[PDB]
Symmetry: D2
Subunit: 494 residues, 4 copies
């Protein structure tokens, strides 16, 4: 049951959001927002830069001051506000789903059922934590009374990527707001609209002014202004590894702000001969092709046991036939475009690279259509570990199938990346499922499924796939700062 | 590496332990402690009663007063004292292992390696918890500061069985003492000696007087006195289901005291055709025969899928013929006696009942020797659910094997008991292991193993197998009382 | 900002609620429900008995079977339903507030603002916990993977009092459902109406059938059937100490169910000379007089330091003469009636006891009116610890003012009654606040306030004031049963 | 009982410690270790560099590989090993205290009772945590079973300062080893000896080869080699702010390793008019001069309310004239030297800044003695906020006293730092104790005391005073990596 997309979609909010009112950019500058499906300009957005971030950081810092409403209201009240924001999003579900599909080239049915549904489920999950974050009373040595407080950190800068604009938006501000921080959010330049529309809803729900500030713009101007800012307490960033490296370096040189990073993945799936081959093919296929492969956790290398390798490749190639490229808003369409020309060129150069190296093409390998950034779902088999397609983050509807015979060998090969973050494991054997998932150097391990993202589980990576976990009970505490209070008393009793 | 037993063993502590002092019973009566197998009298120990329990409760309440040493010392010191008791136990490992094997008819190598080893490891675990028990600072509504305190409960009466005197003793006092309680223990009438000897070690370790009190004597005289006492704050009891009913009932009538019960089981094992046959046979055997089948959690019913049923029975009988009965102190002896004649007659009546009810006797069925309480390792096959041996806790070296063909049938049949203490599950399939263990109404579910009892895990009984769990993080907190403190403040901030 | 009460209030639901349908009593008997202000019959309710509880327990057991919707739905889904119940309660706030006031003689403004507000707030708090209840993965010894599961217990019988029918209702069912249990509720005979109306709303929110059952009736028939039922896993009971003794005893006599009790109190207030006397008087008055002094946490003993004793009594008498008694639905009325004639008799007799005991009666001391059960707000001074009013919970608008001069003695005196549910402490000294509240034997200690019972804090009981806590994080976990799963593995890694 | 120091003290371990074997530096260079009291060379130590660090990281990485002893032993074993190291430290308590006192110019009595005692207590606390670190089982949406694992992070580099070399050594490796990491420690150039002697004790205790590696050397060679190493998973650092900036930057540029810094604050005290003047004086000095004011948490600003200002300064000057400067091992000496000449010049220039900027110095202000770097106990009065001594971090006995008139004025001035490590608060007022301590932007707030550190409380800072906590439950989890395992299952039950 999916309604049709809002026929006449109007872009209403295009300005900077600070202190619950809309601002022009200090520079007077605007910048175009494209439609990755048609290459036509949807609208123009005010272009924030360092000065606009300064306005936004002062707003948030002021909203965080001792005694001000956001600091003095009940924690459950912060929950009710987050719950109400979820209800507003449920009411405005069709609008947002249309805007997300239109602007981010996302298949509409997916934007409506999974993106928005996940946004609402995650916000309600975070809403529930607000008055359940607790500190401890500790029975430490001596005649003293020791307790801790889980206080909000302060001003949190949050840089959102373009592949899941609303989901990442909610996954970042939900925990931050639940813990009582205030935020300055910089959405990706390719996809600012859905965040700006959510800002109008944040206004409607009654969050105190300055608690949420949104400054759209480019990375090397507004993202950098956030990361090197001297009055920002934490920056959270999801995106490429190289920019994340720049973020930790800028934070270290600026004011030693806390940093959490979520970098890309080269996430492996291991398919054992004793796996349910249909479930394995369906989930591995889903894991690399969902949202045109632009997921953080894309299953970009699939290791299959030699006994079942040929049958697996056959079915994988058989499954890629069902895709239908075109406008994400048209019914029946399965696969939208990649977000822009930079990614389109990157993916195409990689597919050409795989062909030059020893690699077997089973389907795809080129672009699709004359307008938009479309890539045929491509499946490479006989991939070896030394190929570019086997080492570089693809972020495209390209599947690499590899072979393995030994358990130890595939564990070493799978872990032999600088990425951690995620992995897939398919087996019906109890021992192997446990021992292998223990051995994989990955932040999330799915067994006999893939990309089952929920709000109750913490998600984050090992190695250079990131810093920190988001959206768990553990994810919520990463937005608190611990304070120990130790009060001298005359005599302590247990 | 097992040493020989203390050659000529002398028992030095036979009186009541109160306020770190040895006492005669108020009446002066003493009672005999027997040696299973030889049926000889080891010595006579003071018989505790209501007058004695009253002395002990008075001591425990004094030791618990606000401002006393046990209440004002650092939690870490309570831990260090627990740690000191553990080292003392290790120094005296050989002595205590002999006394345990002598008094409880326990195979000496078993008492020395597993009983003493487990006691020391559990004492060290509880020691580690003493200063890590914490309360919470809670962000409740309104301008208030709310926190909780995990106070000790108070005076805890603890009634110990005869099957594992030392392990059960440490499992009760360890958590209780770690949290800062004071305790009055009534060890089993059959096996009081080892507990008394630990009492001497408790004095040596430096525990304040009255923190640990031990009252040997009978169940219906000193245990009843503990359970119905008006100034005992909690009673913890391990034993029969009927005595547990009697204890909770008296607790209701006397003063609403906290109660924890650990009752018997009819703990079933499910062996699926996809199981590792030898692991299943070996572990099921261990779970039904360990310590002459008088085990806390004995695997009496073994349900095997028909495909594997006959092969399982074959290997089970082959493994059952590998025992050597006799004096637990003689080297080479595998099976000692049952703890006394009462248990011996019960087991034998059930064996014949099984044969008369039409169960196939595969090996065993009768007594051994003229002296002692010995039972030949017995294996019954073709057992049906309406058979008595399939319904009464045999608490003996008797194994019952049943057949099953349907998963839901066997889940229902294993759960169809008034007991829910433990369960065993044997499979190599991931899905069956997780879902079947979820459906089992058991406090502990072992998969492809059995009787893997560690200190880090709580054991929580279901249904009438008990009330509460011990020895985990959850077990330590059951010996605390929670206190909420709510302080009005002029203004609160997050 | 309190609207006018429903003039009409036609009472719709008067029957037994089982399986989302309405049932007459198996016997056909009904029983009358009074209006304590006018003593005229509001309506007749079906009189449930053992047979009706048996119907209800079977319904709840069926709803709890493995594979049922209540067992298989997502925990967040249970939360979603609890939240839907809260919104419905919000919609019917005016109706339910009128019904609460009509049936329980509660001042309408209080029922609308404080009772319903707390009911919605506690439900939303419980809603938020459903999917945040977690078990542990434990690093226990050996090549094992050990984890625990917090399962729902099963069928929970919940026996509700008459003083806060809706609040207690939500406090018992909110946690039990949040954890995934099913419940059989027995509301007080004097006050079944709001619970039955809540049931219709549970039907409307969409809870699966059998998850909530309500069997109105008397205590010694339907409450007893719950407490002694052979298929009920837990009973939670709020009420008198003597009946609590019966419930704990009955649970022991049949099937050893888990038990939680919250009994009366004789909660003390300690007022130190440096306390803010204005604030101390205001809160002490509120804590003893609120809802005609029928709270479990009534502050009926007030110890004032000699320095401030007379000034305190002066203001208490000034504040106590300020009530306007009458029908709780009429606007302006400050004090409603007692719940029924039995309590009216007891409280008046206690008033007579105090005067013949040589207590200085300052105001009140008699009946009010000639319709209903009204009691003049009474204040006694110069009360001694040996007086009847000083040991017995009066449950009426009777205030006892006492004197103390040394802290050590007054802590002794405050902790010296058979109840320890709660306490108040008024002082500006940091050391006094921490040390005295640590020394007070009470489940909740309020400092410089009283009766600020939020949904985030658990409020437990000491001594004979009960067993267990509710409505905290601690409170929710008591509606779970712990299960340890231990899976043998080929090799474990840290 | 404080014993006499080691007379015949031989330095035995002076080389690089890798794989439980002693190494010469790859270059063959040694570097001298001086005695800060006499400026005499104590000995020469192997000078580690990049090559020596690379060896240590290969050793630690190998010791961390799956299947290695350190990864496969029970967590409780890691605990027993740490406990044995503590017992060893207790046995060699006199040796370590003299070696520590001699090498770090620390008063012998302090090194023996406070430095060693804390090291042993901290180690035992960490030992207790090893097998109590747990993950969670989460009830997330869908037919899944989700759990988390708290794994060890991997190879941890730990860079130690010279002020509390043993204490800092223990605070870093104790938690790291409790969780199962392997570590490469780089002590300060000034104080490598006690770390090397503990390395020998770690061999004796039975730690597997490579789990603890120690590489002495200089900061910009050996520390830098650690922080930028591509195979080190975390760096923990205690030291100056401008080095922490460099470390955080090196981590970002190399392999985005985790970073935890503990920098040193300007920790302020608020002395209220109602404070206990004597104790405030005693503890406020205690906090800034302890160990010649080289403490991790120095009380470098003392704000006093006008009402008690002058008398407070008098007592401060009076108590400051009670010390005996000289050799720390000599009995009776109360104040030792600063660690070196570089520190000595920094301290003296700050005093010159103090006089020139116009603060009233009551005592001290110059060099002391003809040998060594000794600094007279200096007290400055009437200091203002923009003065170097009030804003530039002082490591020295220089004490700063100021006045305040409005409470928020002083809270602003106290929070007007880029440092938030600690704070002091002296008052008897319940409301101010809570409200002011919540308002202070500091990681630890002491009330009516100072520098009462412990192993049970988590320790770390706000703002530029560091990130992360040590030695708490929160401190132990900082050495773990979170992994979510999500296993799809056929049907889920609560």
């Amino acid at each position: 049951a999916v309604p049709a997309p809002l026929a006449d979609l109007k872009i209403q909010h295009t300005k900077i959001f600070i202190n619950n009112e809309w601002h022009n950019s200090v520079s007077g500058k605007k910048f175009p927002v494209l439609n990755p499906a048609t290459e036509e300009v949807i609208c123009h957005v005010e272009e924030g830069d360092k000065a606009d971030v300064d306005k936004a950081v002062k707003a948030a810092r002021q909203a965080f001051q001792i005694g001000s409403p956001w600091r003095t209201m009940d924690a459950s009240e912060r929950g009710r506000l987050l719950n109400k924001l979820a209800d507003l999003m449920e009411r405005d579900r069709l609008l947002l789903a249309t805007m997300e599909a239109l602007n981010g080239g996302k298949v509409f049915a997916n934007a409506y059922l999974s993106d928005l549904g996940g946004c609402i489920k995650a916000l309600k999950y975070c809403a529930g934590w607000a008055d359940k974050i607790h500190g401890q009373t500790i029975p430490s040595d001596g005649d003293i009374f020791t307790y801790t407080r889980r206080e909000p950190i302060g001003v949190c800068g949050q840089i959102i990527p373009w592949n899941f604009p609303m989901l990442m938006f909610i996954w970042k501000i939900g925990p931050a707001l639940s813990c009582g921080n205030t935020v300055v959010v910089k959405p990706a330049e390719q996809t600012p609209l859905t965040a700006l529309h959510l800002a109008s809803l944040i206004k409607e729900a009654g969050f105190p002014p300055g608690v949420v500030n949104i400054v759209p713009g480019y990375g090397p101007t507004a993202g950098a202004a956030i990361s090197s800012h001297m009055d920002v307490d934490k920056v959270a960033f999801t995106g490429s590894t190289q920019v994340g490296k720049l973020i930790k370096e800028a934070a270290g040189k600026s004011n030693l702000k806390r940093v959490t990073l979520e970098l890309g993945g080269k996430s492996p799936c291991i398919v054992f001969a004793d796996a349910d081959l249909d479930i394995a093919v369906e989930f591995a296929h889903h894991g690399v092709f969902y949202h045109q492969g632009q997921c953080c956790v894309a299953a970009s290398r699939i290791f299959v046991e030699e006994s079942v390798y040929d049958e697996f490749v056959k079915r994988s190639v058989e499954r890629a036939k069902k895709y239908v490229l075109g406008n994400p808003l048209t019914p029946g369409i399965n696969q939208g475009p990649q977000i822009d020309k930079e990614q389109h060129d990157k993916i195409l150069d990689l597919i050409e690279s795989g062909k030059k190296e020893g690699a077997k093409l089973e389907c795809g390998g080129g672009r699709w259509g004359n307008k938009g950034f479309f890539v045929q779902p491509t499946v490479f088999s006989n991939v070896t570990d030394e190929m570019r397609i086997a080492k570089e983050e693809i972020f495209g509807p390209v599947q690499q199938i590899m072979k393995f015979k030994s358990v130890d060998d595939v564990i070493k090969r799978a872990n032999n990346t600088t990425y951690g973050l995620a992995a897939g494991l398919f087996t019906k054997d109890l021992d192997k499922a446990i021992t292998v998932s223990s051995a994989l150097q990955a932040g999330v391990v799915w067994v006999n499924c893939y990309m089952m993202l929920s709000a109750q589980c913490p998600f984050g990576g090992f190695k250079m796939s990131g810093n920190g976990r988001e959206l768990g009970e553990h994810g919520l505490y990463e937005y608190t700062e611990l304070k120990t209070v130790a009060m001298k008393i005359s005599q302590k009793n247990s």
